[PDB]
Amino acid sequence: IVRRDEENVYYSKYLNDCIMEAELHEFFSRELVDAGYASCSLCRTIDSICVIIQCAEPEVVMGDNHYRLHKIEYLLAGRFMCDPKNFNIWVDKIIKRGLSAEIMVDNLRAKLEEAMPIRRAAYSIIRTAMRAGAAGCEVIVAGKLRANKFKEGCLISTGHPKRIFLAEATRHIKMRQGVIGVKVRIYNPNIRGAVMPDKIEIGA
């Protein structure tokens, strides 16, 4: 009735582009950290890909008339062998920075490498999140200093709701004595106006 090796191109064409992206995420994390990159995407255009990004400091990523962004633009082209010009990156901005784990973890990492100790940085971060409308955070720092945790309020850590409400991130810090494993988790029960189960109300 149908042949199974025709649709295989379409199926395999979509899978390749997925991997084509993760490499972008890795590269941005290794490069555009200065602007606190958060996440990316893709949109296969007629003759290119309309990759858009999210970075808290949009100004840092782009340069004079986006000059350094243009610089990056050609680079990717050769790596993926796509025609330049057709490439058309886009730049976005994040509003509630105290609601994203990755920007906070990166700022916290930088701060830690500023000679300031774990306690002040962790409490600064949790204060920043809570003042940004979050039910709670949790900072864990592990390395040659064991594990010294810090926590403020209520978090969930089990169930399906975790993957959508709770957002976690991790990093590694190369310090002279060794490595300082640091991670962060934030639980926002109001994301995108989604109703957490077993949360009820009754009226008059």
């Binding site: 109703v195 189960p197 009820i200 009754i202 009226g203």
Partner: protein, 81 residues
């Protein structure tokens, strides 16, 4: 599931005390329908709605046969003397 968690019981008690004139016990259709109303109460999930409604009917018939403490029925008129 036979033992009902605390949330079910507390919300069901609230519903009965609040909407009593329109919850006829011993049926699982009327009470479910009424609990479906958002002016009455809101249930995010189907199974939770059915569970709450069932506990509400059992509480309501237990009360109609013999009212309980903790649920206000405004029965003073027949006990105000």
């Amino acid at each position: 599931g036979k033992v009902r968690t605390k949330t079910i019981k507390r919300a069901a008690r609230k519903i009965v005390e609040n909407n009593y004139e329109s919850l006829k016990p011993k049926d699982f259709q009327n009470n479910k329908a009424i609990c479906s109303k958002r002016n009455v109460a809101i249930i995010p999930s189907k199974r939770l709605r059915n569970k709450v409604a069932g506990y509400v009917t059992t509480l309501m018939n237990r009360v109609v046969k013999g009212p309980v403490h903790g649920i206000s029925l405004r029965l003073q008129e027949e006990e105000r003397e």
